[PDB]
Swiss-Prot record, chain A:
Catalysed reactions listed for this entry: a ubiquinone + NADH + 5 H(+)(in) = a ubiquinol + NAD(+) + 4 H(+)(out)
GO cellular component, one term: respiratory chain complex I
Protein name per its UniProtKB record: NADH-ubiquinone oxidoreductase chain 3
Gene Ontology MF term list: NADH dehydrogenase (ubiquinone) activity
Source organism (scientific name): Sus scrofa
Curated annotation (Swiss-Prot), chain B:
Membrane topology: Multi-pass membrane protein
Protein name per UniProt: NADH-ubiquinone oxidoreductase chain 4L
Organism of provenance: Sus scrofa (Pig)
Subunit structure: Core subunit of respiratory chain NADH dehydrogenase (Complex I) which is composed of 45 different subunits.
Family: Belongs to the complex I subunit 4L family.
Annotated Gene3D superfamilies: 1.10.287.3510
Assigned EC number: 7.1.1.2
One family name in Pfam for this protein: Oxidored_q2
GO process terms (BP): ATP synthesis coupled electron transport
Keywords associated with the record: Electron transport, Membrane, Mitochondrion, Mitochondrion inner membrane, NAD, Respiratory chain, Translocase, Transmembrane, Transmembrane helix, Transport, Ubiquinone
One function term, GO molecular function aspect: NADH dehydrogenase (ubiquinone) activity
EC category name: translocase
Cellular-component GO terms for this entry: mitochondrial inner membrane; respiratory chain complex I
Swiss-Prot record, chain D:
Organism ancestry: Eukaryota, Metazoa, Chordata, Craniata, Vertebrata
Keyword terms: Electron transport, Membrane, Mitochondrion, Mitochondrion inner membrane, NAD, Respiratory chain, Translocase, Transmembrane, Transmembrane helix, Transport, Ubiquinone
Localization in the cell: Mitochondrion inner membrane
Subunit-structure text: Core subunit of respiratory chain NADH dehydrogenase (Complex I) which is composed of 45 different subunits.
EC assignment: 7.1.1.2
Membrane topology summary: Multi-pass membrane protein
Catalysed transformations (reactions): a ubiquinone + NADH + 5 H(+)(in) = a ubiquinol + NAD(+) + 4 H(+)(out)
Transmembrane portions of the chain: 1-19, 23-43, 45-65, 86-106, 147-167
Entry's family note: Belongs to the complex I subunit 6 family.
Gene label: MT-ND6
The species this protein was found in: Sus scrofa (Pig)
Protein name: NADH-ubiquinone oxidoreductase chain 6
Protein's job: Core subunit of the mitochondrial membrane respiratory chain NADH dehydrogenase (Complex I) which catalyzes electron transfer from NADH through the respiratory chain, using ubiquinone as an electron acceptor. Essential for the catalytic activity and assembly of complex I.
Keyword Isomerase applies: no
Presence of keyword Kinase: no
Swiss-Prot record, chain I:
A GO molecular function held by the record: NADH dehydrogenase (ubiquinone) activity
Organism: Sus scrofa
Protein name: NADH-ubiquinone oxidoreductase chain 2
Recorded catalytic activity of this chain's protein: a ubiquinone + NADH + 5 H(+)(in) = a ubiquinol + NAD(+) + 4 H(+)(out)
EC number of the protein: 7.1.1.2
UniProt topology in membrane: Multi-pass membrane protein
Length: 115, 97, 48, 173, 139, 119, 171, 99, 346, 83
C-alpha cells in the first residue's frame, strides 16, 4: 500500500495549499471583479457556443494510432521469446501498417488543417 | 465473489445508460465507450484469476475494436454536427416517414 | 469447530475425484489473522 | 481487505457518473475515475500491464471526446448532476441500486440476483502458485508476436480499414 | 411464468376465488407489459397522462382476466362438466363484452366475444389433450 | 451430418461417394436443370431488349452448359447424401435391436377392427 | 464427497535447514552440483506422483543432505563464507557480479580443502537423469475408466432405396 | 466453425487459445490444468449431446475448480459459525492461528 | 474512389467470412466489427442527410448488439472457461446472446432499425445490407442451435413474422416493405433454426436469391415509390413482368420457388409435434402476400398514367449491364421441382 | 537510371527526413535475411532457462542425457561462453 500512502499524501498536501490560499488571504468580491475577462471589454456573451474544430480529421486518427501503440508496448518482452523469427515479421507488420495508414492519410490530404 | 457483482452491475447501468437517450448522442456514445470498461474489467478478472496465460490476449484486443467502434462513432457524430448543427437525438428524426 | 452442525463430514473430499489439488488459498488463510492475510495474499502486489 | 471491494464500489458509482447523462465530460469525469480505479481492480489481481494500458489509451481516447463536446456537442448552459431533475433522479437511482445489494452482500453474503456468488470478500479467490521469474500477464501479452500471428493480422488490417473508414464517412464529397 | 402455473394448479371449478384471483394476476401482468410498451414507443407527454394510460390498460386487461377467470369456475361448478371446452367459451365471449364495455363501444365488443371465445376454447382444447405450442426439438 | 465421424470439412464429392452409380446424362432431374439454363438464356435478352429466340446463341449455349455442369455434381452429391443417410440408418437399427422389435404380423382373421355403419 | 488424507504432524517435521536466502544462493552453484541426487529424486516424485503428500521421504532426504552440505563448508572454511555471503546480502538484487573477489576466496577452499569444483555456465540447467528405483505411478491423475466411443461406421455405400423418398419424388 | 477451414488445410488460425491446457509460453500452467484435461479428453469424439450425462463428474469438478463457489460456501459456513460461537465464547484461538 | 470501395466491400465480405470460419468466440466478434467498421462508409456513399440518418441509426443498434455479445461470451468464460464455438454452458449468458443476435438480425421489437435504415440509403447499398449481413448472425445461430431455448427463439420468430408482415401493408416506399418483408422471412428461417439447421440454410438461400432478384430488378427500373415503379410499364414492360412474377415468388405460391421454404419449414416442425405454431405463421404469411400483390397490382397487372417526357426514355437505352440478373430470376421462380437438393446443404 | 537519380535528387532536396525515414525503414526489413547473428539470437533465448528442467526416469538407452550435471554429455553452450 506504499503507493497509496504517497498518493494520499500528495493529494492531501495539494489540498492544504488551496485551503489556506482561499480563507487566509482576505475575501472581497463586488461582481465586476467576478466577471469574465475579454481583454478589457465585455464579452459577446457565451464561452459556451460551439467552438468547432478545424482539425477534427486528425483527432480520430490519433485514437487509432494511440490505440495501436498499445499493441506494440509488449515489445520488450516480445523480444525474449523462442520465436523471434515470426516475432520480427509480425512486429514489423504492425509498423508498416501504421506507416501505410499514415501514408494513406497523408496522400489524401488529411493531416493538413481542414478548411 | 463480490468484486464480480460490482462490475457486472456496471454493465447493467451502462446497458441502461446506452439505450436511454435524453438530449444528445454524445452522452450515449460515451456510455457506449465506457460500457466496454466494465467489459474490459470483467474479462480481465477471470483471466488473471484462472492463470490462463494465452487468453490475456483478449482484454487488449477487445480494447482494439471497442474503442475502434467509438472511433467511427464520434467521427459519425461529425457528419451529424454539420448537417444538423447540434447533436440532439430528438432532432435526429428527419426520416419520420 | 464442527460439533454443532447436524451433518458435516470432517475433511471430506472437496471434489468427486481423489487426485490431489493445489489448495485454494481460502482454505489456507481462511481462519488466520488479518495481518497474515495481507502479508502474502496481497503482499507481493502491494509490496514495493 | 477493504481496497479490493472498496475500489470496485467506486467503479460502480463512477459508472453512474456517465450512465446518468450529465454534461458529456462530467460523464467523462465519471468513467475516467472508474478507469482510474478500474486499473486498481486488475492491479490487485496482478495485471499491471493491463491496468496501465487503460490508464494510457482511455486518457488518450478520452482526450478528444472532450474537444468534440466543447467544440460541437456543448450547449449554452452545460448540464450538471444537480441542475436537471431527471439526471439527478438518474444519479440517485444509481446510488440505492448497488447500496441495497452491498448491504445485502455484507449481511448475508449469499445474494442471488441473476448470478449465484458468495460474499467472503475476494482475497480468497487468489492463488498459491509461484510465477518464478516471469509475470504471467506480461508474457501472455508478449505472446502477440509469437503465437498471435493471425490474431495480429486481423487487428492490424482493421486499423488500416479504420483510417479509411474514418476518412470517407467524414469527407463529404 | 409463475402466474401461468399459479392458474393451472387450481382444478377447474373448485377454489373459484383463487382461480379468479390468479386470472387477474395474468391479466394485470399482461396489461403492464403492453402499457410499458405503449408509453415507450408513444410518449404521451407528462407523468399524469402516462400513469392514466397505464391505468387504463392495466384496468382493462385485468378486467378481462377477472371476469373470464370467475366465469370459467362457476360454469364448471354449476354444470359439473370441468372438461367441457365451452366452460372457457362463455368466459371467453364475456371477455369481449367487458372489452366492449371498457372501450365504450359494443361494436367491437361483439366481434371480440367470438374471437376471445374461440381462443379460450382453444386453450382449453390444448390443456385437455396433449397439444403443445412451443415444442422441444424431438426430431 | 455436420458431425458424422470421418468427415472432411469444405470437401465436395469425397473418395467414397464414387462407389455409387453415377447419375445418367439423360437424368430427368438433370435435363430440367438444363432447361433452367435454357430459360435463363432467353430471359437475358429480354432485359437487354434483344431477339429472345434468335440473338447470340453463344450466351444461350453457355447458359445451358453451366447449368448442366454444376447440376451433374450436385445430382451426384444429391444421391450421396441420401445414400449416406440410408447407410448409417440401417446400421443403427441393426446395432439397436431393442428399439425396433418385430411384431408377429397376424392376418385379418384375428384382428378385431370394429365396423362403422354409415347411413 | 469422499476422504482427504494428510500426513500427521510428526512425519512432516524435519531438521529444517535454517539459513538465510543469501547464503543459500551464494553457495547454490556448489550446492546444486554435488547435493543433487536427493534433489533429482525429490521432484521425479513431484512430477510423477503430482502429489506432495507422496513425496515427504524425498523431502526429508534433501533437507538432511543439504544439512550435511552446510556442515561440510562450515567445518572447513567458515570464515571465507562470511565475507562472500554478506556482500551478497548488501546487493539488493543479490547480484553475483559485485562479488568476484569474495567469490574467488570461497572457490579455492572447497576446490583444495575439500575438492568441490565450481560448475560453469549452463551446467546445472540440464535435463540430466536420475536412478530412482521406486515404482512408476500407474494413474497419476487418478482418472477413471472412460466411456466407450460410439460405434464406428463401417461397410459400403449402397444407392438410396427408392430414390430421395421425399414426398412424391420417385428418385 | 460453419466452414471448418482450420481442419481443411490443417493450419491453425485460432485454436491455440481455445482451451486452457493448450501449449503455454514456456509451459506456464493454468489454474485447472488437471481438471480441464480430464474433462476434455473424456468427451472427445463422443458427441456434444453424448457428453453431459457421462462426462459430467469431470465437468462440475472442473467448473468447481474454475469458480470454487461450493468450497467458498464451505469456507462461508466455517467462518460464519466461527464468528457465531467465539463471540459467544467457547472457542479460544490456538496461538498459531492469530500469531 | 472506386478502388477503395472495392476494399471496404471486400472487408465486409472478409469479416463475414471470418465469422463463419472461426472456432474462437473472440474472432466471431472480430468479424462483426470488420463488417461494422467498413459498413458505415458504403451506407452513406451518396452522403445525404438521410444517409447520415440511416448510418447513425444502423451504428447505434449494431454496436449495442455486438457490445452485448461479449459479456454473453464472457459469462460463458466465467462459467465454462471455454472459447471454442460449441453449445453454451451458462443459460443466462446465452439468453443474453440470443437478444444480441436478434438485434443484429432484427427479429424482436429490436427490428425497428432495419426498415428505418433501408429507406435513407440507396438501393444498391440496401441490397448489400439486406442480403449479406443476414449470414454472419445466421452462422452463429446455426452453431449454438444445440442449447437454444425453444420458447425464447420461437417467440422471437413469431413476432418477427407478425410485425414484419403486419406493417408491410402500410408503406408506400418499396425499400420499406422489403425490409418489412425481410423481417417476415427472417422469422421463417429463425423459427426452424432450433429444430433443424439445414432448412434454415435452404430458406436463407431461397430468401437471399429472391432478395437479389427483386432489389436487382429495382435498380434497373430505378424506382423509389410505387408510382415510380408503376411508370416502368411504359419503357420495359418485360422488366415489370418479372417484377410481379418475383412478387408471387416472394409470396410463396407454387410452382414458384418461394414455396420452397414454406413447404419445407412446416415439415419437420410437424415432425417435431409443433403444429399450432406452423399453422399461425402460414396464415399470417398472407399479410406478406397482400402488399406483394398490391405492388404487383400497381406495377404489372394494370396500366398506370405516364408522363409526357416518358416518351423520350424509349429512344435511349439502359447502360448498366447489371450482372447475374437472369440467373437470379430463374433461381427465384422455377426451382420447386428440384426440391431434394436440401440434402446437398445438409 | 536518369529518372531515379533525379527522383532521389528531388526527394533529398525537398523532404530529406522522409527519404531518410524510408531508408532506415527500408534496410531494417531486409537485414534479417542477411543477418548472420539471428541464429545466435535464436540460441540466446533457447539457452536461457526459466522453468527448471525436471529430470527424466532412466529405464536405459539414453546415452545423450547425463546422470549428473557434471558429465560431458548433454546440450552445452560454450558458444555463449566464447561470445
Ligand atoms: C424431353 C427430354 C427427354 C430426354 O432427353 O430425357 C427424358 C427423361 C429420361 O427418360 P426416362 O428415364 O423415361 O424418365 C424417367 C422415367 O419416366 C421415370 O419417371 P421418374 O419418376 O424417374 O421421373 C423423374 C422424377 C424425378 O425428377 C424430377 O422430379 C424432375 C424430372 C423432370 C422431367 C421433365 C422434363 C424436364 C425438362 C423439360 C422441362 C419443361 C418445363 C415446361 C414448363 C413446366 C412448368 C409450367 O420425377 C418426379 O419425381 C416428379 C414428381 C412431381 C414433381 C412436381 C414438382 C412441383 C410441381 C411442378 C409443376 C410444373 C410441372 C413440372 C415442371 C418441372 C418438371 C418436373 O425423362 C424425363 O425427362 C421425364 C420422363 C417422364 C416423367 C414424368 C413424371 C415426372 C416429370 C413430370 C414433368 C411434367 C412436365 C411435363 C413433361 C416434361 C416436359 C415436356
Ligand atoms: C447464393 C447463390 C445466389 C447468389 C449468387 C451471387 C450473386 C451476386 C450478384 C452480384 C451483383 C453485383 C452488382 O451488379 O451490384 C450492383 C450494385 C451497384 O449498382 P449501381 O449503384 O447501379 O452501380 C453504380 C456503380 O457501382 C458505381 O461504381 P463506383 O464508380 O462507385 O465504383 C465502385 C465499383 C468498383 O468496381 C471495380 O473496381 C471493379 O464497385 C461497384 O460498383 C460495386 C461492385 C463491387 C464488387 C467488389 C468485389 C470484390 C471481390 O452493387 C452491389 O449491389 C454490391 C453489393 C455487394 C456485392 C454483391 C453481393 C451480392 C450477393 C450477396 C450474397 C451472396 C450469397 C450468400 C449466400
Ligand atoms: C464452375 C462451373 C460452373 C460455372 C461455370 C461458369 C462459366 C462462366 C464464368 C463466368 C461467369 O459466370 O460470368 C458471369 C457474369 C454474369 O454477367 P451478366 O452480364 O449477368 O451475364 C450476361 C451477359 O450477357 C454476358 O456477357 P455478354 O452479353 O458479352 O455474353 C458473352 C458472355 C456470356 O456470359 C454468360 O453467359 C454469363 C454466364 C452465365 C452462367 C453463369 C453461371 C450460372 C450459375 C451456375 C449454375 C447454377 C445452377 C442453379 C440451379 C440449380 C440449383 C440447385 O461470355 C462470357 O462470359 C465469356 C465466357 C466465360 C468467361 O458474366 C461475366 O462475368 C462475363 C460478362
Ligand atoms: C387469435 C385471434 C383472436 C384473439 C385475439 C384478438 C382479440 C380481439 C378481437 C377483436 C379485435 C377488434 C375488433 C374490432 C371490431 O369488431 O370493430 C367493429 C367491427 C367493424 O366495424 P366497421 O368499422 O365495419 O363499422 C363501420 C361500417 N361501415 C363502414 C359500413 C360504416 O364491427 C363489425 O364488423 C360488425 C359487428 C361484428 C360482426 C361479427 C361478429 C361475430 C364474430 C365474427 C368473427 C368470428 C370468427
Ligand atoms: C433446388 C432447391 C434447393 C437449393 C439448395 C442450394 C443449391 C445451390 C447451392 C449449393 C452449393 C452451396 C452449399 C454447398 C457447398 O458449396 O458447400 C457445402 C459444404 C461446405 O463445407 P461444410 O459442410 O464444412 O460447411 C457447411 C456446413 N453445413 C453443411 C452445416 C451447411 O461442402 C460440403 O461438401 C459439405 C460437407 C459436409 C456435409 C455435412
Ligand atoms: C519523394 C516522392 C514522394 C513525395 O513527394 O513525398 C512528399 C509528399 C508531400 O509531402 P507534404 O509534406 O504533404 O508536402 C507539403 C504539402 N502538403 O508526400 C507524399 O508523397 C506522401 C508521404 C507519405 C510518407 C509516409 C511515411 C511512412 C513511414 C515511412 C518509413 C517506414
Ligand atoms: C395478447 C395481448 C395483445 C395486446 C395487443 C394490444 C394492441 C393495442 C395496443 C395499444 O393500444 O397501445 C399499445 C401501443 C401501440 O398503440 P399506440 O401507439 O398506443 O396507438 C393506439 C391507437 N389506438 O404500444 C405498443 O408498443 C404496442 C405493444 C403491443 C404488445 C402486444
Ligand atoms: C393463451 C396463451 C397460452 C397460456 C394460457 C394459460 C393456460 C396455460 O398454461 O396454457 C399453456 C398450456 C398448458 O400448460 P400446463 O399448465 O403445463 O398444462 C398442464 C397443467 N399445468 O400449454 C400447452 O401446451 C397447452 C395448449 C396451449 C394452447 C395452444 C393453442 C392456443 C390457441 C390457438 C393458437 C392461437
Ligand atoms: C407467368 C408469366 C406471365 C404473368 C403475367 C404477366 C403480366 C401480364 C401480361 C402482360 C405483361 C406486359 C407485357 O408487355 O407483356 C409482354 C411482354 C413483352 O412485350 P414486348 O416488349 O412487346 O415483347 C417484344 C418481344 N420481342 O412480355 C412479358 O410480359 C413476358 C412475361 C414473362 C414473365 C416471366 C416468365 C418466366 C418463365 C415462366
Amino acid at each position: 500500500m506504499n503507493i497509496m500512502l504517497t498518493l494520499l499524501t500528495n493529494v492531501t498536501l495539494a489540498s492544504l495549499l488551496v485551503l489556506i490560499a482561499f480563507w487566509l488571504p482576505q475575501l472581497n468580491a463586488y461582481s465586476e471583479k467576478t466577471s469574465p475577462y475579454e481583454c478589457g471589454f465585455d464579452p459577446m456573451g457565451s464561452a459556451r457556443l460551439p467552438f468547432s474544430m478545424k482539425f477534427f480529421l486528425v483527432a480520430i486518427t490519433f485514437l487509432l494510432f494511440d490505440l495501436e501503440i498499445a499493441l506494440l508496448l509488449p515489445l520488450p518482452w516480445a523480444s525474449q521469446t523462442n520465436n523471434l523469427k515470426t516475432m520480427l515479421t509480425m512486429a514489423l507488420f504492425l509498423l508498416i501498417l501504421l506507416a501505410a495508414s499514415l501514408a494513406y492519410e497523408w496522400t489524401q490530404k488529411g493531416l493538413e488543417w481542414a478548411e | 465473489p463480490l468484486v464480480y457483482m460490482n462490475i457486472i452491475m456496471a454493465f447493467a447501468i451502462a446497458l441502461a445508460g446506452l439505450l436511454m437517450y435524453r438530449s444528445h448522442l454524445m452522452s450515449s456514445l460515451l456510455c457506449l465507450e465506457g460500457m466496454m470498461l466494465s467489459l474490459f474489467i470483467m474479462s480481465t478478472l477471470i483471466i488473471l484469476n484462472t492463470h490462463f496465460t494465452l487468453a490475456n490476449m483478449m482484454p487488449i484486443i477487445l480494447l482494439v475494436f471497442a474503442a475502434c467502434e467509438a472511433a467511427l462513432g464520434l467521427s459519425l457524430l461529425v457528419m451529424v454536427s454539420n448537417t444538423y448543427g447540434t447533436d440532439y437525438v430528438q432532432n435526429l428524426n428527419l426520416l419520420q416517414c | 469447530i464442527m460439533k454443532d452442525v447436524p451433518d458435516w463430514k470432517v475433511g471430506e473430499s472437496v471434489f468427486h475425484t481423489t487426485r490431489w489439488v493445489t489448495p485454494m488459498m481460502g482454505e489456507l488463510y481462511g481462519l488466520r489473522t488479518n495481518e497474515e492475510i495481507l502479508s502474502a495474499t496481497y503482499g507481493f502486489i502491494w509490496y514495493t | 481487505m477493504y481496497i479490493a471491494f472498496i475500489l470496485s464500489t467506486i467503479f460502480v458509482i463512477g459508472f453512474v457518473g456517465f450512465s446518468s447523462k450529465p454534461s458529456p465530460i462530467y460523464g467523462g469525469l465519471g468513467l475516467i475515475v472508474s478507469g482510474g480505479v478500474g486499473c486498481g481492480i486488475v492491479l490487485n489481481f496482478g495485471g499491471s500491464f493491463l491496468g496501465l494500458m487503460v490508464f494510457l489509451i482511455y486518457l488518450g481516447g478520452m482526450l478528444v471526446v472532450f474537444g468534440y463536446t466543447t467544440a460541437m456537442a456543448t450547449e449554452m448552459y452545460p448540464e450538471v448532476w444537480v441542475s436537471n431533475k431527471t439526471v439527478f433522479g438518474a444519479f440517485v437511482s444509481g446510488l440505492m441500486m448497488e447500496f441495497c445489494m452491498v448491504y445485502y452482500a455484507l449481511k448475508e453474503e449469499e445474494v442471488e440476483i441473476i448470478f449465484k456468488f458468495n460474499g467472503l470478500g475476494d482475497w480468497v479467490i487468489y492463488d498459491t502458485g509461484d510465477s518464478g521469474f516471469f509475470s504471467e500477464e506480461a508474457m501472455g501479452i508478449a505472446a502477440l508476436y509469437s503465437y498471435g500471428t493471425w490474431l495480429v493480422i486481423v487487428t492490424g488490417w482493421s486499423l488500416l480499414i479504420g483510417v479509411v473508414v474514418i476518412m470517407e464517412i467524414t469527407r463529404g464529397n | 411464468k409463475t402466474l401461468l402455473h399459479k392458474y393451472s394448479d387450481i382444478p377447474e371449478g373448485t377454489e373459484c376465488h383463487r382461480k379468479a384471483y390468479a386470472s387477474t394476476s395474468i391479466g394485470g401482468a399482461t396489461g403492464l407489459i403492453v402499457s410499458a410498451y405503449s408509453i415507450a414507443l408513444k410518449p404521451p407527454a407528462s407523468f399524469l397522462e402516462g400513469v392514466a394510460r397505464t391505468g387504463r390498460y392495466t384496468f382493462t386487461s385485468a378486467a378481462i382476466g377477472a371476469i373470464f377467470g370467475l366465469t370459467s369456475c362457476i360454469s364448471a361448478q354449476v354444470r359439473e362438466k370441468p372438461d367441457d371446452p365451452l366452460n372457457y367459451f362463455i368466459g371467453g365471449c364475456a371477455g369481449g363484452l367487458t372489452l366492449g364495455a371498457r372501450t365504450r363501444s359494443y361494436g367491437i365488443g361483439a366481434a371480440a366475444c367470438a374471437y376471445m371465445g374461440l381462443t379460450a376454447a382453444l386453450v382449453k382444447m390444448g390443456q385437455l389433450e396433449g397439444w403443445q405450442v412451443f415444442a422441444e426439438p424431438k426430431v | 451430418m455436420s458431425g458424422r465421424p470421418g468427415r472432411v470439412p469444405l470437401q465436395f464429392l469425397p473418395n467414397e461417394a464414387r462407389s455409387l452409380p453415377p447419375p445418367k446424362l439423360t437424368d430427368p432431374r438433370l435435363v430440367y436443370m438444363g432447361f433452367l439454363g435454357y430459360c435463363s438464356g432467353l430471359i437475358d435478352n429480354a432485359i437487354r431488349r434483344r431477339p429472345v429466340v434468335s440473338a447470340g446463341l453463344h450466351r444461350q449455349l453457355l447458359y445451358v452448359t453451366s447449368f448442366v455442369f454444376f447440376g451433374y455434381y450436385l445430382l451426384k452429391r444429391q444421391d450421396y447424401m441420401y445414400a449416406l443417410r440410408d447407410h448409417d440408418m440401417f446400421a443403427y437399427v441393426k446395432s439397436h435391436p431393442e428399439d425396433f422389435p418385430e411384431k408377429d404380423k397376424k392376418t385379418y382373421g384375428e384382428i378385431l377392427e370394429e365396423f362403422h355403419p354409415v347411413r | 464427497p469422499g476422504i482427504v488424507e494428510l500426513p500427521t504432524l510428526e512425519d512432516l517435521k524435519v531438521q529444517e535447514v535454517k539459513v538465510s536466502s543469501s547464503v543459500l544462493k551464494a553457495a547454490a552453484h556448489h550446492y546444486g552440483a554435488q547435493c543433487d541426487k536427493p534433489n533429482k529424486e525429490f521432484m521425479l516424485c513431484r512430477w510423477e506422483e503430482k502429489d506432495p503428500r507422496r513425496c515427504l521421504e524425498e523431502g526429508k532426504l534433501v533437507n538432511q543432505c543439504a544439512l550435511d552440505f552446510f556442515r561440510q563448508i562450515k567445518r572447513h572454511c567458515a570464515e571465507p563464507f562470511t565475507e562472500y555471503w554478506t556482500c551478497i546480502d548488501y546487493s539488493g538484487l543479490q547480484l553475483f557480479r559485485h562479488c568476484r573477489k569474495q567469490q574467488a576466496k570461497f572457490d579455492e577452499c572447497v576446490l583444495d580443502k575439500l575438492g568441490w569444483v565450481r560448475p560453469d555456465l549452463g551446467e546445472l540447467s540440464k535435463v540430466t537423469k536420475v536412478k530412482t528405483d521406486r515404482p512408476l505411478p500407474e494413474n497419476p491423475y487418478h482418472s477413471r475408466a472412460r466411456p466407450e466411443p460410439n460405434p464406428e461406421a463401417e461397410g459400403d455405400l449402397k444407392p438410396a432405396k427408392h430414390g430421395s423418398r421425399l414426398f412424391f419424388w420417385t428418385m | 466453425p460453419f466452414f471448418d477451414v482450420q481442419k481443411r488445410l490443417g493450419l491453425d488460425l485460432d485454436r491455440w487459445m481455445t482451451i486452457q491446457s493448450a501449449e503455454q509460453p514456456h509451459k506456464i500452467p493454468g489454474r485447472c490444468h488437471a481438471f480441464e484435461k480430464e474433462w476434455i479428453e473424456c468427451a472427445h469424439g463422443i458427441g456434444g449431446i453424448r457428453a453431459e450425462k457421462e462426462c459430467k463428474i469431470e465437468f462440475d469438478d472442473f467448473v468447481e475448480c474454475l469458480l470454487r463457489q461450493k468450497t467458498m460456501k464451505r469456507l462461508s459456513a466455517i467462518k460464519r459459525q466461527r464468528d457465531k460461537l467465539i463471540k459467544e465464547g467457547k472457542y479460544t484461538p490456538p496461538p498459531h492461528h492469530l500469531g | 474512389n472506386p478502388i477503395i470501395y472495392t476494399t471496404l466491400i471486400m472487408t465486409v465480405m472478409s469479416g463475414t467470412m471470418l465469422v463463419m470460419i472461426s472456432s474462437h468466440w473472440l474472432l466471431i466478434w472480430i468479424g462483426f466489427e470488420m463488417n461494422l467498421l467498413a459498413m458505415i462508409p458504403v451506407l452513406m456513399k451518396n452522403f445525404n442527410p438521410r444517409a447520415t440518418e440511416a448510418a447513425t441509426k444502423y451504428f447505434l443498434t449494431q454496436a449495442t448488439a455486438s457490445m452485448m455479445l461479449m459479456m454473453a461470451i464472457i459469462i460463458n468464460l466465467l462459467y465454462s472457461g471455454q472459447w471454442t464455438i460449441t453449445k453454451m454452458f451458462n443459460p443466462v449468458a446465452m439468453t443474453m446472446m440470443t437478444m444480441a443476435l436478434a438485434m443484429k438480425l432484427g427479429l424482436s421489437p429490436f427490428h425497428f432499425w432495419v426498415p428505418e435504415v433501408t429507406q435513407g440509403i440507396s438501393l444498391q447499398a440496401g441490397l448489400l445490407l439486406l442480403t449479406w449481413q443476414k449470414l454472419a448472425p445466421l452462422s452463429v445461430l446455426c452453431q449454438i442451435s444445440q442449447s437454444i431455448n425453444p420458447n425464447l427463439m420461437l417467440t422471437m420468430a413469431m413476432l418477427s413474422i407478425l410485425i414484419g408482415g403486419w406493417g408491410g401493408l402500410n408503406q408506400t416506399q418499396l425499400r420499406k416493405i422489403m425490409a418489412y418483408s425481410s423481417i417476415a422471412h427472417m422469422g421463417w428461417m429463425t423459427a426452424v433454426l432450433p429444430y433443424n439447421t439445414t432448412m434454415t440454410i435452404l430458406n436463407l438461400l431461397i430468401y437471399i436469391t429472391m432478395t437479389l432478384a427483386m432489389f436487382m430488378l429495382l435498380i434497373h427500373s430505378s424506382a423509389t415509390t410505387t408510382l415510380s415503379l408503376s411508370h416502368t410499364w411504359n419503357k420495359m414492360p418485360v422488366i415489370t413482368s418479372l417484377m410481379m412474377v418475383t412478387l408471387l415468388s416472394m409470396g410463396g405460391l407454387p410452382p414458384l420457388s418461394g414455396f420452397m421454404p414454406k413447404w419445407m419449414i412446416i415439415q419437420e416442425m410437424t415432425k417435431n409435434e409443433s403444429i399450432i405454431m406452423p399453422t399461425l405463421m402460414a396464415m399470417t404469411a398472407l399479410l406478406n402476400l397482400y402488399f406483394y400483390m398490391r405492388l404487383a397490382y400497381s406495377s404489372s397487372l394494370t396500366m398506370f398514367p405516364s408522363t409526357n417526357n416518358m416518351k423520350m426514355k424509349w429512344q435511349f437505352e439502359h447502360t448498366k449491364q447489371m450482372k447475374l440478373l437472369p440467373t437470379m430470376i430463374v433461381l427465384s421462380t422455377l426451382v420447386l421441382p428440384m426440391t431434394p437438393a436440401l440434402s446437398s446443404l445438409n | 537510371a536518369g529518372r531515379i537519380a533525379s527522383f532521389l535528387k528531388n526527394a533529398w532536396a525537398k523532404e530529406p527526413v522522409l527519404v531518410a525515414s524510408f531508408a532506415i525503414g527500408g534496410l531494417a526489413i531486409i537485414l534479417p535475411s542477411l543477418s548472420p547473428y539471428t541464429n545466435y539470437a535464436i540460441r540466446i533465448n533457447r539457452a536461457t532457462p526459466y522453468n527448471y528442467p525436471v529430470p527424466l526416469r532412466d529405464d536405459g538407452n539414453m546415452p545423450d542425457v547425463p546422470s549428473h550435471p557434471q558429465d560431458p554429455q548433454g546440450p552445452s553452450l560454450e558458444w555463449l561462453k566464447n561470445l
